[PDB]
Amino acid sequence: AEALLYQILPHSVAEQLKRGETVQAEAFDSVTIYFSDIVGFTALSAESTPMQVVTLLNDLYTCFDAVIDNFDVYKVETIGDAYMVVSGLPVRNGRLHACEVARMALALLDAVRSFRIRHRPQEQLRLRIGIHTGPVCAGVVGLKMPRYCLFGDTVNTASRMESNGEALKIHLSSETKAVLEEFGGFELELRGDVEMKGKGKVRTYWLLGER
Amino acid sequence: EALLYQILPHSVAEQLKRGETVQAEAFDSVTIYFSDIVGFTALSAESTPMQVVTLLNDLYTCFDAVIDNFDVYKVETIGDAYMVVSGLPVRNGRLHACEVARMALALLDAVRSFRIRHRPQEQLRLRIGIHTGPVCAGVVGLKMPRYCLFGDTVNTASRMESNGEALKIHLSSETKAVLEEFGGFELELRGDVEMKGKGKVRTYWLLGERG
Numbered sequence: 001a002e003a004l005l006y007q008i009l010p011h012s013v014a015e016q017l018k019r020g021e022t023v024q025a026e027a028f029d030s031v032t033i034y035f036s037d038i039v040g041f042t043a044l045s046a047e048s049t050p051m052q053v054v055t056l057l058n059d060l061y062t063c064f065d066a067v068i069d070n071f072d073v074y075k076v077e078t079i080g081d082a083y084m085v086v087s088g089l090p091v092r093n094g095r096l097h098a099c100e101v102a103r104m105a106l107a108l109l110d111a112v113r114s115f116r117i118r119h120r121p122q123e124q125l126r127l128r129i130g131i132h133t134g135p136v137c138a139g140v141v142g143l144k145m146p147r148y149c150l151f152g153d154t155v156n157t158a159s160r161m162e163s164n165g166e167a168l169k170i171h172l173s174s175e176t177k178a179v180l181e182e183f184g185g186f187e188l189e190l191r192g193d194v195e196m197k198g199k200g201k202v203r204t205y206w207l208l209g210e211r
Numbered sequence: 212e213a214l215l216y217q218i219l220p221h222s223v224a225e226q227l228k229r230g231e232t233v234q235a236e237a238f239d240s241v242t243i244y245f246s247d248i249v250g251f252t253a254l255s256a257e258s259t260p261m262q263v264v265t266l267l268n269d270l271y272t273c274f275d276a277v278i279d280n281f282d283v284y285k286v287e288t289i290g291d292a293y294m295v296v297s298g299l300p301v302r303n304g305r306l307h308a309c310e311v312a313r314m315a316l317a318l319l320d321a322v323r324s325f326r327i328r329h330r331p332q333e334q335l336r337l338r339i340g341i342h343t344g345p346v347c348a349g350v351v352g353l354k355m356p357r358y359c360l361f362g363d364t365v366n367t368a369s370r371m372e373s374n375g376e377a378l379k380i381h382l383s384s385e386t387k388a389v390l391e392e393f394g395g396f397e398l399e400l401r402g403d404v405e406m407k408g409k410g411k412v413r414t415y416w417l418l419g420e421r422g
């Protein structure tokens with residue numbers, strides 16, 4: 001009964017609500033947001049019967065949920081093909097959110113390379129990944145069906161970083177690059193250009209891998 | 212028991228509960244409605260987390276009671292965005308446009324008396340766009356099934372809202388024809404706007420129905 005009402009909230013919040021306690025809206029000084037989008041999906045889904053695209057979405061969801069569940073991240077929403085995954089949000093963990101998300105991005109890049117579309121087998125699916133780090137305020141909205149929600153400008157900065165990114169590449173801002181470099185062991189390359197979405201003096205980086 | 216399939220439409224939920232299986236379908240005509248709050252990023256950026264969480268709860272409670280009066284289906288709700296379609300699960304002729312237009316007018320009426328708890332002397336500004344066209348639908352997801360839509364009319368229904376105006380209902384030229392063959396709706400031409408997809412195209416405003 002209650003186990004099917006708290007199927008969207010994180011496990012910590014689900015246990016908090018189950019035992020009767022109240023969950024307050026909170027502010028977090030640093031969380032890491034990851035935004036992913038499949039490029040060229042409205043053209044591949046424009047030349048398929050209604051069953052092929054449904055099956056492709058089912059297969060992609062089942063493939064991604066088996067990799068997202070390997071880490072400490074929490075998947076906020078999944079509409080269409082876009083994915084939004086946040087780390088550090090429900091229970092704080094210091095500065096490990098950047099490392100967990102940057103490892104999950106490489107894992108998801110490796111998982112896509114073996115994904116097979118069953119109505120065009122000799123073809124690979126392209127992906128776009130953008131990561132950002134910043135403070136957000138989060139809380140539970142809804143009463144008929146509860147849902148964890150986030151507010152802050154870092155969400156839209158992460159979405160914009162994903163939008164400006166390239167296919168099959170991981171696009172980091174300069175706020176998360178500092179954290180990753182301080183942790184050490186990652187490979188980051190300066191993009192060599194400054195984006196023109198909301199500013200003109202912002203430097204962005206490509207993530208290439210980890211040692 | 213009731214909350215087993217609370218996300219899916221009543222028809223699809225009953226079909227799954229009975230025991231049968233559902234198939235992806237192609238719909239010849241479906242009407243989509245997209246709305247959002249203009250200026251919400253600058254209003255949640257000067258309020259404490261409890262204020263904005265309670266505001267979101269109030270807004271959801273206000274809108275979900277106006278929606279239930281009409282024959283429509285609420286697809287998704289993220290942040291302040293709202294997506295509502297009609298004609299989708301059970302075809303009902305050309306009645307989707309009329310129901311969606313009536314719902315849009317009722318939602319515009321109901322947001323004039325909405326009260327923000329932490330600023331009583333201010334009202335929220337809505338932005339609404341409506342489109343009609345062929346879309347496909349299917350139930351995707353395992354262990355968490357959900358209805359979803361594929362097509363290009365979703366993109367244009369969203370673009371109509373993105374190019375719209377606050378406290379005004381924007382219509383394409385595809386739904387104006389349906390509403391003028393219905394008769395009884397006051398439509399005023401906006402002009403040859405420059406849509407982000409094609410370019411020079413005629414769109415309209417909706418001002419009210421004469422009863």
Ligand SMILES: Nc1nc2c(ncn2[C@@H]2O[C@H](COP(=O)(O)CP(=O)(O)OP(=O)(O)O)[C@@H](O)[C@H]2O)c(=O)[nH]1
Binds near residue numbers: 037360
């Ligand atoms: N639930 C929603 N689905 C949408 C929306 N806009 C588009 N779509 C649908 O989801 C899919 C994504 O389309 P996008 O708007 O992201 C356009 P496209 O995929 O060409 O962009 P890129 O993949 O970034 O090149 C596509 O099938 C659309 O029909 C929206 O606002 N909400």
Ligand SMILES: Nc1nc2c(ncn2[C@@H]2O[C@H](COP(=O)(O)CP(=O)(O)OP(=O)(O)O)[C@@H](O)[C@H]2O)c(=O)[nH]1
Binds near residue numbers: 149247
């Ligand atoms: N949970 C989510 N919240 C989002 C998402 N995208 C945006 N947002 C939140 O909603 C806020 C609204 O930003 P939008 O991009 O919708 C722009 P706004 O609504 O302020 O309208 P204009 O400024 O008139 O374009 C945004 O800054 C975030 O706090 C998303 O994918 N998921």
Ligand SMILES: [Mg+2]
Binds near residue numbers: 037039040041042
């Ligand atoms: Mg896409």
Ligand SMILES: [Mg+2]
Binds near residue numbers: 248292
């Ligand atoms: Mg908004």
